[PDB]
Amino acid sequence: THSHGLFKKLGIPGPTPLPFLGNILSYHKGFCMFDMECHKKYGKVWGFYDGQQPVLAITDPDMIKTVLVKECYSVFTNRRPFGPVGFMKSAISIAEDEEWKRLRSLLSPTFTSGKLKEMVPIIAQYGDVLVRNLRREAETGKPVTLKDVFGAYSMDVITSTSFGVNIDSLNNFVENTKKLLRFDFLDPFFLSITVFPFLIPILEVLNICVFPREVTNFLRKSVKRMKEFLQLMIDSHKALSDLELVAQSIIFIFAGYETTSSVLSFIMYELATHPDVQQKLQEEIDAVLPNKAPPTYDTVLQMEYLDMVVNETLRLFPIAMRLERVCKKDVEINGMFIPKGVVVMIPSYALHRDPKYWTEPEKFLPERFSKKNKDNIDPYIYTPFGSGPRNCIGMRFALMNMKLALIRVLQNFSFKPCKETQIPLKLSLGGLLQPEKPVVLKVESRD
Amino acid sequence: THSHGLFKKLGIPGPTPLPFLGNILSYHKGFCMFDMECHKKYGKVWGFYDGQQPVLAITDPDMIKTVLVKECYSVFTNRRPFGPVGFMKSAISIAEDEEWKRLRSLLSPTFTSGKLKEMVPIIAQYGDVLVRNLRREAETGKPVTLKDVFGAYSMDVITSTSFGVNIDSLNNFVENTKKLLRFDFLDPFFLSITVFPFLIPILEVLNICVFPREVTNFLRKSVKRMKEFLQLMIDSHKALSDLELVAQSIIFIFAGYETTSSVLSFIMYELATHPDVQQKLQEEIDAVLPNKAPPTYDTVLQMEYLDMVVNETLRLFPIAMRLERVCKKDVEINGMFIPKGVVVMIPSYALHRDPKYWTEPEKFLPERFSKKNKDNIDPYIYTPFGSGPRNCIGMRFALMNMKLALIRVLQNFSFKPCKETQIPLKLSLGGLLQPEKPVVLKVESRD
């Protein structure tokens, strides 16, 4: 337990680590609370230890720009290798160095504006399915669990756009990609792996992994039954393998399900707790789409206030919480020596709520992102989708998918806080950015 | 246990591996016997599995040249990472990629002809100490264990040339660098690590290592007591650390002790079992050094037949047995696809005894390396010191040290087979190239 002396010899402050555990006991208050308190106590830069792994947090916009953009291909190319992943090591978000660069090139044409434009009529059909299912619980007279309806919509969207299967999940493959697509408190296992990272090779050789070794076997034979986004990988650097075909699919499914449904639930909580914003957004939607006109590609991009609501919600709730890069070699960025093997981390949650760049950070104020004030927002302090060559590849898809769902939802319904609604919203202290109690709101039809 | 299908899908022949073990059970006959039988059975190229690690053996001189010389910096830069090494990971023979390239640059000036020329008067003193200790067992009238006297000479030489300490080991620091410098059958532990390579991180975090955690602490404080080759590392890419200072020293000690003493014992066995070669060599020594003149730098290089004896012995007994390189990326060398992660291996022992390049390989014939026939010897079939940028850095030092010992020894003594001498010499079946029974020979003074 002697890596614990690296930050003191470097002159970098931080919390004093305990033997074996490091600083992981400070995660009791939550990973995000630990980042904000370290930022207030140590200032610009600090370091801590996840067990024996040294992590260096940076808050300077120029230094964040160097890590994520300038020295990406050379120094900060890969993310932190985490617990037993098995064949998921071939996934793009997991691949490293040249194997990632190949997959990034093979999958970048999937998310072009031309491909995204052809997905609008497909995912607009499920927006109508979402509105239909939203009424049978709106006419029910009792509050709605938003994560359930948004979860079924996110799965219906990602299943048809990635492959081509069209299922109504809320009324029902789905049983293997919904229940078998949930995260039943892997927090204790993630903590033990962090404390015992040397046990990872043992779990790998035993073929033990975070995912169940069936869901993949289901998707493995499902993709094999589909032969006669999934098109681009088959039509074809280096040709993609069949097992690597499934790896990228699973990443897109988890990305399309959890991220899209979680942020949509955070948005509706802010619209219900701020009705004047909800009305102003419905007025912009009604003015751009008169008489409940169906949303289109060019239409969604015209709604300026809709973009401000999504941006402000992504400020308060950056579902990735952190950006991380592994230091491949000894470097000196912006006047600071970074030794090899240190996980450089950018605390997005803490930076999005820093009282240095934001007026009243705890307030939900869409006016920060208006055409006037948006110029004063540093793109390396507000990083909801990351930045640089390894940023979110599905940023435009996620923005388009969420906005299409928000428009169709707000065209027909209004959302008010129910008696069961937790106000203020408290965040879970686990490894995922999600509310403590599930978001429930009263839904009322507008017509 | 499914890496076992890589060579069959590549079209590469080889022995069928067992689950978990791979082909390690074929090591019962010895690592070198396994290489020769695979070469006779599969021809040019074959593959096997050390547990789950795929190893690809190559015998083509053009392909060996590409692996060791052409694509060293790009593809085949590092050797196979083996069991728990601890702080010895900073050693030059263990370092990888840019950390090795730095150490190779910092330690190459140590072995220049200018430095080697200044070491001759130092190591010639121990040649006289070796002759003195060789008489008290020659006048004893009973055979001599060559590994003991050559072991003390090799340690006395490497201790003074690396640092500056001058000790008579055979008559006595030495207790910590002799007994604590021996290999007490680590073969079962090496086998279990090969079968359980996933247990290596467990031994590392427990600070368990192949070396005793005292010998290093002795050398760590001994080097610290020496402050007031060791000069070049202190006088100073990047400056060398104090803990990395000890790592390179331990590698030089094990290299100077085992390799020098083992080959010298193999040479004297061939000179005793071939007296006409021993006489012819003594005649060349007497003609170049009249009246037992002390050997010098330029003198040793003039003895052509002495170079032929050392070369031929290094053919039959290449103490490294194999050269290995880890494939850093997917490549296609000389018309063959090499997947990433495969350990490319060059079987030096089998190639040195191949009936395709050598007439009567089992025969000790120094005439193969005469000025006439040496031109027909492919430098990539006869690779006693390796080749390319990562060849033996102490080649000229080892050649000079052994020849200086051979000259002073043959100037005074003659060596004959004793009743206890094992004829023919059989090799141990462990991981080291050493005789089955220790080499004992009758020593007689010439004056």
Ligand code: HEM
């Ligand atoms: C609100 C929705 C989303 C948010 C806020 C989000 C955010 C992020 C962030 C912060 C990163 C890390 C960037 C970095 O480290 O610099 C990332 C990476 C990534 N995201 Fe997203 N994401 C969202 C939705 C999606 C969707 C829908 C997909 C795919 C269908 C997706 C695919 C990916 C991939 C593949 C990566 C890794 C890229 C690489 O390693 O090269 N994301 N995302």
Ligand code: HEM
């Ligand atoms: C008869 C004596 C010796 C023989 C036959 C021998 C042979 C070899 C061989 C075959 C290699 C591997 C080359 C390759 O993989 O291409 C090697 C590497 C090496 N040898 Fe020797 N060696 C001897 C003595 C020594 C001595 C006396 C020293 C130092 C004092 C030494 C230092 C090294 C080092 C440092 C390496 C690794 C170089 C690197 O990784 O860059 N060797 N030797």
